[PDB]
Structure formats: structure tokens, C-alpha cells
Amino acid sequence: VQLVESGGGLVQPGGSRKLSCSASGFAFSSFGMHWVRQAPEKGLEWVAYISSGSGTIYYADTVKGRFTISRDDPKNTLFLQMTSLRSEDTAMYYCVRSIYYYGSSPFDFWGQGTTLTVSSADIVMTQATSSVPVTPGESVSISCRSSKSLLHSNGNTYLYWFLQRPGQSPQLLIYRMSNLASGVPDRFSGSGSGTAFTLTISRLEAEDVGVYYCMQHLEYPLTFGAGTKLEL
Amino acid sequence: DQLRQEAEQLKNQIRDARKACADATLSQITNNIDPVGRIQMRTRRTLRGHLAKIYAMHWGTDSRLLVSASQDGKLIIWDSYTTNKVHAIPLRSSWVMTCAYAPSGNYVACGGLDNICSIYNLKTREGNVRVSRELAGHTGYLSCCRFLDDNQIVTSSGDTTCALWDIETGQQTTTFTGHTGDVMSLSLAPDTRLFVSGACDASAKLWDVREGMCRQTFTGHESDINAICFFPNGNAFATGSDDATCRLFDLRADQELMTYSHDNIICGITSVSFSKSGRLLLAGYDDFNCNVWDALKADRAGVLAGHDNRVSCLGVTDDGMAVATGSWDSFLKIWN
Amino acid sequence: YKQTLSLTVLTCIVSLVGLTGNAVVLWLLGCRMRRNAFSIYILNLAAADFLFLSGRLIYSLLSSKILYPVMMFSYFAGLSFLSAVSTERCLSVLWPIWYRCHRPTHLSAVVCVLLWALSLLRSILEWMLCQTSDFITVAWLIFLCVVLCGSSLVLLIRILCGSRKIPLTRLYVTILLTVLVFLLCGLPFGIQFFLFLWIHVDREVLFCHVHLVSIFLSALNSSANPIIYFFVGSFR
Amino acid sequence: RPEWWMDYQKRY
Amino acid sequence: AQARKLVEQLKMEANIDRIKVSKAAADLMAYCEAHAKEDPLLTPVPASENPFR
Amino acid sequence: TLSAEDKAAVERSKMIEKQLQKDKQVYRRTLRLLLLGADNSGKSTIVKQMRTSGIFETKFQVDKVNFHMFDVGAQRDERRKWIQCFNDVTAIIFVVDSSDYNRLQEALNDFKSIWNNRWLRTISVILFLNKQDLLAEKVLAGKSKIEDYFPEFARYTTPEDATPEPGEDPRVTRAKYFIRKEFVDISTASGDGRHICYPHFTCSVDTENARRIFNDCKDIILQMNLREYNLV
């Protein structure tokens, strides 16, 4: 599984730029794709989504009309064309794969990202503490709150916990508030009451140092949290 | 030479022991219990994706995911609650006769006239289902396969022999060679220590998985046994045959305990399954229908009659909520 | 013309037999395969025939503003479905591989709904429409007749001439019975009603012999369609 | 509209 | 050649310990009675809990 | 009332359904044949010219129609069960070695069993009386006589409808027509109108066998259509 973003660079405001995402090592056609931008020293924010196939395209309100997301499956390449860029569009754009079926784990892989510098019904995700210094071996807990309950009538609580280590792309830790992602040690556990959720790292290690982001997948604006830092 | 008369004497003494065991009959003991009454199940779901006849289906242990195999060469993994098609696996060989969902849910087994048990990984990082392995070594068509673990799978074949395979190595860990006819169905015991296999020789043999030998043999049926299903506690099992009857055998008592037949039923049984409590014995028939028997009283508790062709496969969920029935009409119906 | 009207009763009698027959079909095929294309055409034909026979029965018992439009609409839908059944039979015999393998599995419906729409368009037009509508209609009835008869004739030419040896009396009987029932029981009502609506002919002969007999024949055709096309099959 | 139309003929 | 294997198999099958059919039937009845309440297909559950309705 | 991750699962199911319709087109367009025959029948040569492992698949085309022939090569000497998998198959190509009178009764019993199989009631049999050159050579040599195995041959005469266009010897015509009649007797004796047998006289090296199969399959499809329209 490899997602390599390209394009980006320095763009004068009001210009246009086509970010690309070459996908290898997995069935790209069967995966939905997201563009998720992270402004410098700021948290994650969902940009765009194109479902498996090409139906069900979505955009964040902040980019509707300006950004257009497409994909060429035969070449296994996702595309984000930007029309009239703004200073607020400066960010590292991450390519995220997400396959949706019963028991699946979407947002399970993020590309390395590409830097782009430019010369009210949404669910709000709140994280109690932006920073929590802690020592290895201790059991630490990170908190999240949702303005709207993420517990759906089908019994799923659409809360995702991602870990972004310094200088690295975010990695999925939990995908339905309780399901540990493949390749994630049992150290990480998720729980929640339907509107408040907690990610517990029982035996924190040096590899667990980073920013922990919460995300809601109840409604597609896919709002992230501000990000709770962990440092040692 | 003299071993033939020795076998005759041993068979006679086995029959004598079985008769000594027959101090009563289930029917006599079950007379006092209240009758299940008349059960009415309705078709909650209909699964319409298969191009051709469905020959096998297996429920996942989650009681929601379901794998079905069709002669169109295509395993379909269904979300039973939503009728969503989770996966559509194209098979290398279209003449699939069996399919099994691993208790972990990570794999599906299938196979058929191609004498291979194909193990498909449903949990690849690539996001597509791929052949984990092709267990070869059976010299006949694969009639039934059941996972005992993500690495251990027991299969029955037209070679009149069953085989426990180590999936990692792709080799038959052990072989079971007591049957004299095509083995059509096998059923694992709840504890996975034993399994029963029914063959075209009209006999069902209990097999010790570890030792690799036939503990007991049962021979009530007059015709080929197409379906076999353990009772929930694992101390008894039901067999369905071309004889148009089902039979409940007890391991401990080592003989037939009840026969489930009706004069109006002349077709052979294709599949059998128990309810969670084991009180209902559901059996599919070549008559495009299915009969729900009172396993303890032998009465016909009900009928599931929503299929336009032969009922090939039948399976009750682990939690006992619903029963799936696949058919040659290319559909699968969930009943509740 | 009061005895002659005795038919207004005979037609009513043959109406039910036909209404009951068409209901059976509707059901039976609402649960039957409805897979065999012939059966997505016989189901549509059964619906059209049922509704036409209901209109006819109410008209006979009428002895109102919605009776004629609905009755005609059903009449023409049923006739078009008979023509489509014939023209498919011919196509399934002429191109058996195409019919069994490459034929869209939807054309049944695409065709049944399209013919329903054609009948509805004709009925609405005639409601709105000096009036040559009637002569277009009559032309439409002649087109349905030539389509049905030509398809049946082409099918017979393919089978007979064909260097094949197979029981064929059933084929001849079914084809000729279908064509004859359509030609002498189905078409006459529409043809006479729309033709002699402008071709002046004696009132007595038209109403007594050319109109009531046509009505009874049309009801007979609608009633015999379920037997001719579905029931014979079942009780093969 | 012709004079000889008769009842049933006058469709509407 | 196979006569000896068949005879040995018969002998092994014959020496197994025996259990009365009455006891086996009683055990099956006891299991069904114990798990009767936990059988959705036997006693239909209220439609609220039924995931197929 | 579906979450975002359900709508996407429903879209995945819709894509699978589209792929399944694409597969249905091919499944319908392809005619499936079951090649049965004894070891001496010569069926292997037939399939070779037309062009453990439990079932062998051969593909060929005639007049843009696709044929998938299946030779069940590695199974026990018993078909009561696996033969049930081959219902609705467009036809059973049953190959018989005509030149071997010693096994001709065995081949007739096999053809009976196949023809009278309860699951093959609607399946037509294209009967290839293979190895006609060997049959003609054996009949002309005179060393062996069919009579020895089938006494009725002594009191059998060629029908007036026989058409030996190539100019074969009358004895060879009598023999081959007696064998064809032996098979057609079983064919007619029982199931009539639900399934037809299409006898053919073929040699080991015959280029017309594929054309024979195509014509017989066209007639089988025509018969299915006729039955669908109650014309037969």
C-alpha cells in the first residue's frame, strides 16, 4: 500500500493547481478516496471525497466550487484540481484511502502528503487538552466530545482516532470508537458513551509520541478534532 | 479369508450392543413433552445477486455475514441485515459445490468438481479478496469444507475420504479413509474435537480430528446421505439422505434415535440444520421447499416454501436468529 | 333490436369467465417466474384484458364518462401485447441464439410499458381530437394485424420449410388459433367501430350485427387470451 | 359531426 | 488385504462404552428445555430485537 | 436513515451488482457443454481438435457463439452425485467408440443412465458415434461381426431413409445405422419432447464436429424457445 502525492509547491493566490496521488500496492478502484488538508501547525481538516467508482463526490464547504476531485482508475491516480487558490488553502494535502463495507476500516492508509503554499450544521469535534506531557509506561487517556451524538441507529459510533507522529502522515488507530486498526498494538483502546469518547494508551512508548486526532464519520463533512499533543 | 466371517460376527455383536442400548425410544420419552405447535417463518430477506444455481451457503459466526457459492463461478459475501453484497469473489472453477466461512471471518473456503479447496483471504491489505491457497490432493470433487481454525480446514470429497489440511503448508495433515462412497457432507462438533461425515454409502462416520480414526459408524439410511449436521450439544447429529428421510443419531448411545419422514415427502434431503436449542430440525428438499421438524417429537412443525427450484443449502445463524436457504433458483432467502 | 341485444348479456357472461381467467393469470404470474419473457407479455396482456373486460362488463350492466376511454385504452393495449407476443415468437424462432442469449432481459418490460404508453397516448389524443385520429387508429389496428399475421407467417415459413423433423402439430395449432382469435375476435371491434363511424351504413345492420357482435367477439378474445396463452401451457 | 351518429358512436 | 483393516476397525468400534437410549433421549430433552428460551427460531422474539424486521 | 458509511456500503453493493450484470451477459452468451464418454470413446481427441485436476475446461467458438466444454476427467467411477451439477447445461456431448462391439453394450448402458437421469431430464444429448473409420474398417474386414454381441443385427435392415452420400459400403452403412438405432431406441423409449438426442457419425480427425455441436445447440435453444412459447 503506497499513496504518493505530487504537485503542490508555491502558487500565487487566485491561481490553479492540480494535485495528484499515485496509488500502488492495492486495488485502488475498490477504494473510496479522500483529500484531507493540514494547515501548517494546525489540525487536520477534511477536503474532498470521491467514492469507489466515481459517484458520491463530496467537498467541504470551505472548498465547494473551487476544488474538484476526480480519479483515473486505469492509471490508479487520484486528482484534486484547485481553481482560485487562497492563503487559507496553504496546507499539506494528504491522500487517504477508505473502503466502505460492513466491518471495513476506512481511512486506514494516508499518503505522505504534498505541501501547497499560497503566496453551521457540521458536527464539532472538541478535544479537552491540546497537550498532555506523559512518561513511557504510564496509562494515558485522550478525550473527545461531539456536538452531536455519533451513535447511529444501526449501533455504530462513527468515531475515528488517528495518530500523527512528528514528520509523519496520520495513521488510523481506532475506526468505530472501539475497533483497533490492523497493525496497531493492543496498547491503544477506544471507548465512548455515544457523545464522549476516550482513547487509552496503556503502556505509552516513544513510538506513541505525536498528535492524536479525533474524526466523525456520521455525516460526510468529516470534521476532525483540534488534535491533542503528547510529549515526553 | 476368515476375516469376512470375523467382520460378520463383529457387526452382529455391534448390533447386539445397540439393541441392548435400546431400552426405550426418543418418541416414547418425548411423548410427554409439549408439542412445538405450528411454526410460521417468513422470508425477511431475499438475496438476488447470483447468476446460476446456488450450491452452498455458510453463515459467518457474527450471524450477519453470509457466504454463498453459485455455479456461475462466484462466491458472494452478503450483509444479511442490509442485503448488501460485501464481496463478489470470482472463482477459478465455476463448478463449486461447497463454501465455508472461517469462524474468525478472515477467510472463505470453496471448491467443487475441481478437486481443490480454495482458501480466499477476505482480509488483505490490498483491499481485494485473493486466493490464500489451493489445497490440492483430493482425487474427487470437493463436496464439503469447514474451517476448524484460520489454518486448519477439514474437507470431504468424492474420493470417499475426508482430509484435515494445514492451510499454511497446503498439505493434508491427516486423512480419513473409512467411507466406501462419495462423502457429501461433514459437520464439525461444537468443540471441534470430532466431526461427522455422511457419504453415498448411506453411512455416517464420526471421526476424531486428532487421532484421525473413525470412532463410530451409523447405517440407518437406505440411500446416499447428502447432508449432515451436529446437534448443538455435540452428542447427537442429524443426517439427510436421498431416502427422503432425516435421521437423528446419538453418539453416546451409538445408534439411530429418531427418523423424520412423511408419506407425502418422496424427494431426497439436500441440507439439514438445527436451531440453537436443537428443538427444530430444518431440512431442505429437492421439492423446492424446506421442512421444519420437531427434532424431539418427529412432527412436521412447519414449512418454508418460498423457492422456485431445489433447496440446495441451509444454515442457521450461530445466535439462532434466522435461517438462510439457498436454492437452484439462484436466490437465498433468510427466514425468521 | 331488443332480442338482438340479448348479446349485451352474452357478452357479459363471456366477460366474467374471462375476468376470472385473467385474474388467475395475473396472480399466478405475479408469483410465477415472470421470468420467461412470454410471461412479461402475458402478464401485461392479462392486466389489459382484465381491465378491458371489466369496462365491457360495466358497460353491459350500464343498461359512464370513464367507461369508453378506459375500455378502449385496455382494448388497444391488449391488441398491441398480442402483436408483441407474436413478433417475439417469430424472433425467438428466427434468431433462437439471440433470443435466448443476447436478448436484453428487460425488453419485455421496455416493450410492455412502451405499448402501454402508446395506448394511453392514443386514448388521450382521441379525447383531445377534423378527427382523422380515428383513421390513424384504424391504421394502427391494421398495422398491429399485419405485424401479428406477418410474424406468425414468417415463423411458420421458418419452421415448415426448415429441414427439420419434429412434432409440429402443436406449433401449427397454436399459431393458427392465435392468429384466428386475434383476427376474428380481437380486431373486428376496433376496426368496425372506427371505420363505420365515418363510412355511412344502415343503422340497424351496424348496431345489431356489426357492433354488438363485434363487442361480443372482442370480449371472447379477451377471455380466450388467458386460456390460449397461459393455461394451455400449464395444463400442458 | 355527422348526423347519423347514434348514441354509442358519440364517444364523448 | 483390506479385510484386516476392516476387522480391526469393527473391533475398535465395538469396544466403545455404551449409553442407554433412554439416557441419551433424556439428555437431548434436557438440552432442548434448557436452551428453549434462548432459541429465537423456536419462540419468536419481539420484532424490536429481530434484526431482520 | 443511513450513515455515511452505510451509504458507501450500499454504493459498493451497487458496483458489485453492476459487475454481476456484466458477468450475467457473458454467462448467458456462453453455451456450456458436458463432455461425457468412456476412456476408449475418443473424446480427448474430439476436445483437442475442437480447441488434482477434477474438471477440464475447453473453450471454442462457432459463428461468434462461445462454447465452454467440460470434461470431468478425475473423478471416481460414479456420477450419481456430481452429474447433478450439470443441469441446464446446453447439452451433453456423449462420445461412444462405435468400432468396439465388446464395450458397446456398456456404452449403451451408460447412455441410458445419462438419458434417464432425473436431473438431466431437460438436457439434450449430442451423441458422437466416434471412430467411424475404425468401425468401417472392422466391418469390411469381417473378422468380427456385430451379431456376435447384438443378435438383432442378424434381423436388421437399413431403413430406406439412409443417406450414405460419400459412397460408403452398404455393410458399413448397415452397421453404423444399427448402432445409431441402438442409441436412438433408448433416447425415444423414454423421455420425449423434454430432451432430444442428436446422433452424429464422426471420425477421430473431423473438422466438422464443432459445427455439428453448434447446429445441435442452435436446435436445442430453438426447442427451449418453442417450449417457452408453448409451440412444442
What is the 3-state composition of chain D as percent helix, strand, coil, each rounded to the nearest 5? 0, 0, 100
Specify the length of chain C in residues.
Answer: 236
At B11, give phi and psi (nearest 5°).
Answer: -65, -40
Nearest to A101 among B86, B126, B128 (CB): B86
Rounded Cα distance between F136 and F139, Å, is: 5
Do A127 and A19 form a contact (C-beta atoms < 8 A)? no
Rounded Cα distance between A189 and A163, Å, is: 13
Q: Buried b vs exposed e over C179-192: b needs ≥16 C-beta within 10 Å?
A: bebbeebbbbbbbb
Nearest to F85 among B86, B97, B182 (CB): B97
CB contact under 8 A, C126 and D4: no
Residues from B contacting F (CB-CB < 8 Å) are 49, 51-53, 55, 71-72, 74, 76, 79, 82-88, 90, 93, 95, 97, 112-116, 136-143, 158-160, 181-182, 184, 200, 224, 328
Rounded Cα distance between C181 and C229, Å, is: 11
CA B113 to chain centre: 18
Q: Supply angle C-alpha C158, C163, C169, rounded to 5.
A: 65
What does DSSP say about strands B183-188 and B194-199: parallel, antiparallel, or unpaired? antiparallel
Rounded alpha-carbon distances, angstroms, from residue C54 to C46, C48, C50, C210: 12, 10, 6, 22
Q: Which of C144, C129, C168, C32 has its CA nearest to residue C79?
A: C144
Coil, helix or strand at residue F117: coil
Do B95 and F55 form a contact (C-beta atoms < 8 A)? yes
CB contact under 8 A, C203 and D9: no
Do C220 and C187 form a contact (C-beta atoms < 8 A)? no
What chain D residue is nearest to C128 in terms of C-alpha separation?
Answer: D12
Rounded Cα distance between F136 and F175, Å, is: 8
CA B235 to chain centre: 16
What is the domain count for chain E?
1
Nearest to F75 among B76, B137, B141 (CB): B141
Q: For chain B, which chains pass the contact test of at least 3 CB pairs under 8 Å?
A: A, E, F
CB contact under 8 A, A26 and B82: no
Rounded Cα distance between C156 and B3, Å, is: 71
Do C138 and C195 form a contact (C-beta atoms < 8 A)? yes
At F5, give phi and psi (nearest 5°).
Answer: -95, 10
Interface check for F8 against chain A (CB to CB < 8 A): the answer is yes
E40: CATH: 4.10.260.10
- The whole-angstrom distance between F191's CA and the closest CA on chain B is 20
Q: Which cell numbers hold the place of B139?
A: 482425487
CB contact under 8 A, F54 and B49: no
CA C111 to chain centre: 15
Rounded Cα distance between F194 and A23, Å, is: 55
Alpha helices in chain B (DSSP H): 3-21, 26-30
Rounded Cα distance between B182 and B142, Å, is: 10
CB contact under 8 A, C38 and F229: yes
The Cβ of residue B303 has, within 10 Å, a number of other Cβ atoms equal to 15
Preceding-residue numbers of gaps in chain C (C–N over 2.5 Å):
63, 129
CB contact under 8 A, A53 and F4: no
* B contacts of F52 (beta carbons < 8 Å): 115, 136-139
Q: Buried b vs exposed e over B177-190: b needs ≥16 C-beta within 10 Å?
A: ebbebbbbbbbbbe
Rounded alpha-carbon distances, angstroms, from residue B304 to B287, B288, B334, B336, E53: 11, 9, 10, 10, 17
CB contact under 8 A, D6 and C203: yes
Rounded Cα distance between A108 and A111, Å, is: 10
What chain E residue is nearest to B293 in terms of C-alpha separation?
Answer: E42
Rounded Cα distance between A101 and A89, Å, is: 32
Question: In the sheet that B332-335 helps form, which strands lie side by side, from edge to edge?
Answer: B43-47, B332-335, B323-327, B311-316
- In single-letter form, the type of residue at position C129 comes to L
Preceding-residue numbers of gaps in chain A (C–N over 2.5 Å):
119
Do B162 and B182 form a contact (C-beta atoms < 8 A)? no
- Measured between alpha carbons, how far apart are the two ends of chain B, in Å? 57
Nearest to B279 among E4, E7, E39 (CB): E39
Q: For chain A, which chains pass the contact test of at least 3 CB pairs under 8 Å?
A: B, F
* D contacts of C203 (beta carbons < 8 Å): 4, 6
Coil, helix or strand at residue F13: helix
Rounded alpha-carbon distances, angstroms, from residue C217 to C11, C146, C231: 8, 19, 20
Do B195 and B147 form a contact (C-beta atoms < 8 A)? no
What single DSSP character describes residue F21? H
Nearest to A102 among B65, B125, B128 (CB): B65
Q: Which of residues 74-93 of A touch F (CB under 8 A)?
A: none
Do B298 and B260 form a contact (C-beta atoms < 8 A)? yes
CA atoms within 13 A on the CB side of F131: 23
Enter the resolution in angstroms: 2.7
Coil, helix or strand at residue A210: coil
**Residue whose C-alpha cell is 461444537:** B190
* F contacts of C99 (beta carbons < 8 Å): 221, 225
Do B151 and B168 form a contact (C-beta atoms < 8 A)? yes
Do B76 and B88 form a contact (C-beta atoms < 8 A)? yes
**Residue whose C-alpha cell is 349485451:** C8
Rounded Cα distance between B113 and B73, Å, is: 12
Rounded Cα distance between A188 and A11, Å, is: 40
* D contacts of C65 (beta carbons < 8 Å): 12
Rounded Cα distance between C80 and C137, Å, is: 12
Q: Which cell numbers hold the place of A162?
A: 488517528
Burial of A177 (0-12, 13-18, 19+ CB in 10 A): buried
CB contact under 8 A, F230 and C96: no
At B25, give phi and psi (nearest 5°).
Answer: -130, 145
What single DSSP character describes residue A224? B
Rounded alpha-carbon distances, angstroms, from residue A122 to A143, A146, A157, A220, C136: 20, 10, 16, 9, 61
Rounded Cα distance between A44 and A25, Å, is: 25
**Residue whose C-alpha cell is 416493450:** C111
What single DSSP character describes residue B268? P
Q: Which of B241, B322, A173 has its CA nearest to residue E53?
A: B322
Alpha helices in F116-193 (DSSP H): 132-141, 170-189
Q: Which of B42, B43, B33 has its CA nearest to residue B299?
A: B33
- Give the domain range for residue E9: 1-49
Coil, helix or strand at residue B25: coil
Rounded Cα distance between F204 and F201, Å, is: 10
What chain D residue is nearest to C134 in terms of C-alpha separation?
Answer: D11
Q: Which of residues 15-74 of A touch F (CB under 8 A)?
A: 30, 32, 51-53, 55-56
Q: For chain C, which chains pass the contact test of at least 3 CB pairs under 8 Å?
A: D, F
Containing H/E element for E25?
helix E21-35
Coil, helix or strand at residue B282: strand
CA B184 to chain centre: 8
* C contacts of D2 (beta carbons < 8 Å): 198, 200
DSSP result, B209-274: TTT-SEEEEE---SS-EEEEEE-TTSSEEEEEETTS-EEEEETTTTEEEEEE--TT--SPEEEEEE
Do C101 and F64 form a contact (C-beta atoms < 8 A)? no
CB contact under 8 A, C102 and F28: yes
Interface check for F11 against chain A (CB to CB < 8 A): the answer is yes
- The whole-angstrom distance between D7's CA and the closest CA on chain C is 10
* D contacts of C197 (beta carbons < 8 Å): 5, 9
Q: Which of F129, F108, F134 has its CA nearest to residue F212?
A: F129
Task: Answer positive or negative: Cα dihedral of B177, B180, B184, B189.
Answer: negative
Q: Which residues contact F6 (CB under 8 A, 6 or more apart)?
A: A152, A154, B82
How determined?
cryo-EM
Interface check for B23 against chain A (CB to CB < 8 A): the answer is no
Do F214 and F143 form a contact (C-beta atoms < 8 A)? no
Largest CA distance in chain D: 15
CB contact under 8 A, B178 and E21: no
The Cβ of residue F117 has, within 10 Å, a number of other Cβ atoms equal to 18
Do B203 and B195 form a contact (C-beta atoms < 8 A)? no
Rounded Cα distance between F129 and F124, Å, is: 16
Q: Which cell numbers hold the place of B95?
A: 463448478
Do E18 and B219 form a contact (C-beta atoms < 8 A)? no
CB contact under 8 A, B224 and F87: no
Rounded Cα distance between C99 and A54, Å, is: 34
Do A18 and A7 form a contact (C-beta atoms < 8 A)? yes
What does DSSP say about strands A114-118 and A159-164: parallel, antiparallel, or unpaired? unpaired
Do E35 and B277 form a contact (C-beta atoms < 8 A)? yes
**Residue whose C-alpha cell is 482425487:** B139
What does DSSP say about strands A9-11 and A114-118: parallel, antiparallel, or unpaired? parallel
Quick check: do E and B touch, 3+ CB pairs under 8 A?
yes
Rounded alpha-carbon distances, angstroms, from residue B2 to B15, C1, E14: 20, 102, 19
Q: Round the CA-based radius of gyration of chain E to a whole number and report it.
A: 21
Q: Which residues contact B15 (CB under 8 A, 6 or more apart)?
A: none
* A contacts of F5 (beta carbons < 8 Å): 100, 106, 156, 158, 217
CB contact under 8 A, F82 and B115: no
- In single-letter form, the type of residue at position B190 comes to P
Rounded alpha-carbon distances, angstroms, from residue B334 to B47, B59, B103, C57: 8, 11, 20, 44
Q: Which cell numbers hold the place of B286?
A: 429437492
Rounded Cα distance between B267 and B256, Å, is: 21
Rounded Cα distance between C40 and C115, Å, is: 13
Rounded Cα distance between A170 and A44, Å, is: 9
Question: Torsion-angle region of residue B319: left (phi > 0), alpha (psi -120 to 50) or beta?
Answer: alpha
